[PDB]
Design an enzyme around this catalytic site. Structure first.
Site, PDB file in Angstrom:
ATOM      1  N   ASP A  99       0.802  -1.221   0.000  1.00 27.51           N
ATOM      2  CA  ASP A  99       0.000   0.000   0.000  1.00 27.51           C
ATOM      3  C   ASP A  99       0.839   1.278   0.000  1.00 27.51           C
ATOM      4  O   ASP A  99       0.294   2.358  -0.262  1.00 27.51           O
ATOM      5  CB  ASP A  99      -0.966  -0.004   1.205  1.00 27.51           C
ATOM      6  CG  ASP A  99      -0.251  -0.188   2.562  1.00 27.51           C
ATOM      7  OD1 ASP A  99       0.846  -0.802   2.601  1.00 27.51           O
ATOM      8  OD2 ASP A  99      -0.806   0.278   3.594  1.00 27.51           O
ATOM      9  N   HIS A 141      -1.483   8.648   8.772  1.00 23.82           N
ATOM     10  CA  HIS A 141      -1.142   7.282   9.164  1.00 23.82           C
ATOM     11  C   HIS A 141       0.358   7.042   9.313  1.00 23.82           C
ATOM     12  O   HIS A 141       0.737   5.998   9.845  1.00 23.82           O
ATOM     13  CB  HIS A 141      -1.681   6.258   8.159  1.00 23.82           C
ATOM     14  CG  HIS A 141      -3.168   6.301   7.978  1.00 23.82           C
ATOM     15  ND1 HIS A 141      -4.055   6.086   9.013  1.00 23.82           N
ATOM     16  CD2 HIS A 141      -3.924   6.508   6.875  1.00 23.82           C
ATOM     17  CE1 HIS A 141      -5.293   6.165   8.557  1.00 23.82           C
ATOM     18  NE2 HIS A 141      -5.239   6.422   7.262  1.00 23.82           N
ATOM     19  N   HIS A 178     -11.158   7.328   8.146  1.00 22.99           N
ATOM     20  CA  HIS A 178     -10.303   6.356   8.807  1.00 22.99           C
ATOM     21  C   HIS A 178      -9.677   6.933  10.076  1.00 22.99           C
ATOM     22  O   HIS A 178      -9.437   8.141  10.186  1.00 22.99           O
ATOM     23  CB  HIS A 178      -9.194   5.881   7.867  1.00 22.99           C
ATOM     24  CG  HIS A 178      -9.692   5.316   6.575  1.00 22.99           C
ATOM     25  ND1 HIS A 178      -9.791   6.067   5.429  1.00 22.99           N
ATOM     26  CD2 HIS A 178     -10.116   4.073   6.248  1.00 22.99           C
ATOM     27  CE1 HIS A 178     -10.248   5.311   4.446  1.00 22.99           C
ATOM     28  NE2 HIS A 178     -10.453   4.096   4.917  1.00 22.99           N
ATOM     29  N   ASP A 268     -13.054  11.277   2.385  1.00 26.82           N
ATOM     30  CA  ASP A 268     -13.569   9.963   2.038  1.00 26.82           C
ATOM     31  C   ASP A 268     -14.828   9.609   2.806  1.00 26.82           C
ATOM     32  O   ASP A 268     -15.372   8.528   2.567  1.00 26.82           O
ATOM     33  CB  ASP A 268     -12.497   8.875   2.228  1.00 26.82           C
ATOM     34  CG  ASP A 268     -11.570   9.154   3.394  1.00 26.82           C
ATOM     35  OD1 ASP A 268     -11.902  10.001   4.256  1.00 26.82           O
ATOM     36  OD2 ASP A 268     -10.504   8.506   3.437  1.00 26.82           O
ATOM     37  N   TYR A 311     -11.065   9.882  -2.588  1.00 25.45           N
ATOM     38  CA  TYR A 311     -10.702   9.059  -3.734  1.00 25.45           C
ATOM     39  C   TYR A 311     -11.582   9.301  -4.945  1.00 25.45           C
ATOM     40  O   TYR A 311     -11.243   8.845  -6.044  1.00 25.45           O
ATOM     41  CB  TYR A 311     -10.700   7.573  -3.311  1.00 25.45           C
ATOM     42  CG  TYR A 311      -9.703   7.452  -2.194  1.00 25.45           C
ATOM     43  CD1 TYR A 311      -8.343   7.498  -2.471  1.00 25.45           C
ATOM     44  CD2 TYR A 311     -10.102   7.446  -0.863  1.00 25.45           C
ATOM     45  CE1 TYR A 311      -7.401   7.474  -1.465  1.00 25.45           C
ATOM     46  CE2 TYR A 311      -9.161   7.431   0.169  1.00 25.45           C
ATOM     47  CZ  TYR A 311      -7.801   7.439  -0.147  1.00 25.45           C
ATOM     48  OH  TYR A 311      -6.821   7.412   0.830  1.00 25.45           O
TER      49      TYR A 311
END
Ligand code: FGN
Ligand code: K
Ligand code: K
Ligand code: ZN
Length: 397
Positions: A99, A141, A178, A268, A311
């Site tokens: 990823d 992240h 997220h 998102d 996205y």
């Protein structure tokens, strides 16, 4: 003034990645197409006077071996030859794989976001800007020695580090679908940076944290109770998302009294994102995003606004263009009249099928979370000797 990070080289670097493509150019060219740029102060990405200063800047959070590996990854991906077995091993040891693949600009691309968000924080510190937007930043992240979720360098951590070192308290608000695990973990032991993430969490869903562990962990050491989390169920709409985090935001501000707010505004959560977990919109009569930003801006605290996930590139543009107009209105007091149709500009064709600014979408457990979170906020207030009326905050819920 309201600042916004961009620049010609900045734009090329933000659009050099295989995953996010030309997203940043759609976003800034829609902000430009709507005549918002003259209202905004351009904040140029920070640059350094030597490799050592850059290295010093980035290794305020990231390990030197990791930074070295990321730069070596870029060097390897700019030559013809394939990686040796030892080089693949070394990349694996930093999760520079899967990823978070390598590509010819991976280091310059990752550093550009740090350049953007460090400059954004300095504009706030020197009081040049009351708000600064960086739609090229927000990569929450990334860890000290590990990429994750296409986040190679954590620009948020570094910007926040600069702010708290400028007693200084920072409230971080992570609105991405997220969990913002990199920032939460960076400040796990620090009461002066309070972190708050609303997100989806369910078995198997990236990245796995910000939910029951069975207890909710919330910081450690002197940072006990300083990490806030609100996991919500899929399908949530604007009004329920707004009501879920509205009172938590207001009470965090009442109680922490932050010197700065940093808002990660990952797009998102839009109902039209290929994720399709939440059902939020960009609608402006109300968009959960716009409701949350307006609320944070009504506080009149110097605020960094950042991008993140997102996205469906044109709907991310549609959203972030509206957030940018909203910031101009609440900060400067000038009404912003946005036409309902996309103006003609380079990327006009990407806004099929009907070329409207609205996205093409037709729209017990949270009360327990509120009681849990409000109790954590009292534990945070008690541990950190903060003064506040426990009935004025409980009134919010
Ligand atoms: O948004 C993120 C992270 C996104 C992410 C992380 C791990 C695995 C998949 C992920 O995104 C799904 C995805 C991709 Cl990778 C590419 C195209 C479409 C979709 Cl849905 N940070 O918070
Ligand atoms: K989040
Ligand atoms: K913290
Ligand atoms: Zn995301």
């Amino acid at each position: 003034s309201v600042g916004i990070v961009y620049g010609d080289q900045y734009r090329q670097l933000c659009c050099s990645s295989p995953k996010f493509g030309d997203r940043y150019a759609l976003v800034m060219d829609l902000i430009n197409a709507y005549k918002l740029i003259p209202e905004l102060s351009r904040v140029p990405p920070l640059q350094w006077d030597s490799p050592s200063r850059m290295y010093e800047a980035v290794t305020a959070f990231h390990s030197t071996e990791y930074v070295d590996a990321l730069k070596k990854l870029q060097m390897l991906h700019c030559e013809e030859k394939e990686l040796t077995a030892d080089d693949e091993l070394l990349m694996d040891s930093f999760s520079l794989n899967y990823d978070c693949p390598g590509f010819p600009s991976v280091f310059d691309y990752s550093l550009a976001a740090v350049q953007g968000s460090l400059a954004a924080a300095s504009a706030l510190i020197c009081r040049h800007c009351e708000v600064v937007i960086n739609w090229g930043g927000g990569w929450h992240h990334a860890k000290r020695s590990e990429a994750s979720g296409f986040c190679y360098l954590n620009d948020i951590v570094l910007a926040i580090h600069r702010l708290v070192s400028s007693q200084t308290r920072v409230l971080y608000v992570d609105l991405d679908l997220h969990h913002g695990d990199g920032v939460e973990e960076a400040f796990w032991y620090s009461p002066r940076v309070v972190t708050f993430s609303v997100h989806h969490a369910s078995p198997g869903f990236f990245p796995g944290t910000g939910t029951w562990n069975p207890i909710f962990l919330n910081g450690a050491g002197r940072g006990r109770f300083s990490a806030f989390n609100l996991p919500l169920e899929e399908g949530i709409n604007d009004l329920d998302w707004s009501n879920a985090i509205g009172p938590i935001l207001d009470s965090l501000n009442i109680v922490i009294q932050p010197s700065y707010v940093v808002v990660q505004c990952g797009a998102d959560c839009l109902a039209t994102d290929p994720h399709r977990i939440f059902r939020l919109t960009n609608f402006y009569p109300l968009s959960g995003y716009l409701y949350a930003i307006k609320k944070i801006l009504s506080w009149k605290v110097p605020t960094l606004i950042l991008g993140g996930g997102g996205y469906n590139f044109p709907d991310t543009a549609r959203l972030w263009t509206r957030v940018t107009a909203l910031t101009i209105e609440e900060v400067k007091g000038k009404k912003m009249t946005i036409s309902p149709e996309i103006p003609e500009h380079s990327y006009f064709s990407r806004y099929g099928p009907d070329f409207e600014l609205d996205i093409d979408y037709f729209p017990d457990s949270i009360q327990k979370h509120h009681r849990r979170i409000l109790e954590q906020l009292r534990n945070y207030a008690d541990l950190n000797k903060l003064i506040y009326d426990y009935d004025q905050v409980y009134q919010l819920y």
